Amino acid sequence: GNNFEYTLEASKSLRQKPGDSTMTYLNKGQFYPITLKEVSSSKVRSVIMVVFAEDKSREDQLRHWKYWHSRQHTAKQRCIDIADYKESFNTISNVEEIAYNAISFTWDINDEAKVFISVNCLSTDFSSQVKGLPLNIQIDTYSYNNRSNKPVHRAYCQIKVFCDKGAERKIRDEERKQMDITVFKPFIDLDTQPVLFIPDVHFAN
């Protein structure tokens, strides 16, 4: 009995042509409302993360993260952040920053978990010239028993990140030439573990 659903409340682009893929637009470093719900008719752990969508080798993805982190203006700056709203903490607990691109927390499936998440990197922050690297917000949900050590449910959401207020601009700008909630898309490959970026400065010299 584990039908989960996740939502991201931001602006998503319109599909022009059949086969085109939809994108949700975010501003860099701005908190967005995400909900998590179990809608079957006791407690679980979910990991919200930012990952590369193009399914690249682990070495590549780390290279990129290092490249990114290499250029942040504080070493303390993460890829994904969560806000301290009491609204959110009435519904989640055991918040843990297991990596610079992942946040873990537990919640009760009899409740709706509410969190507020910012993504802090641009799609073009991984090379200093081209187009951008496709990014997803991915959510893996674990039974608390975690017997299998695998997630029991996974979903994702394709995103593009902008600086300043560029998310709202890009929307209005595709509107001149020519919905409030993005629902995460489930997938069933429970084995592929995602690359966690844990910056380390041992032996810098």
Collapse the DSSP code of 122 into the 3-class scheme (helix H, G, I; strand E, B; otherwise coil) and give the result. coil
Range of the domain at 101: 1-205
Contacts of 156 (CB under 8 A, 6+ apart): 53, 136, 137, 138, 139, 184, 185, 187
Tell me how far the alpha carbon of residue 29 is from its chain's centroid.
12
In sequence order, the β-bridge partners of residue 186 are: 155
Pairing of strands 102-108, 80-82: unpaired
Given the structure tokens 């920053």, which residue do they identify?
97
C-alpha span between 127 and 104 (Å, rounded): 29
| Resolved by | X-ray
Given the structure tokens 């919200």, which residue do they identify?
48
Pairing of strands 32-38, 113-119: antiparallel
The data reach a resolution, in angstroms, of: 2.3
Domain count, the chain: 1
Cβ-contact 194, 48 below 8 angstroms: no
C-alpha span between 63 and 9 (Å, rounded): 30
Across the beta sheet with 182-183, the strand order is 80-82, 113-119, 32-38, 4-8, 182-183
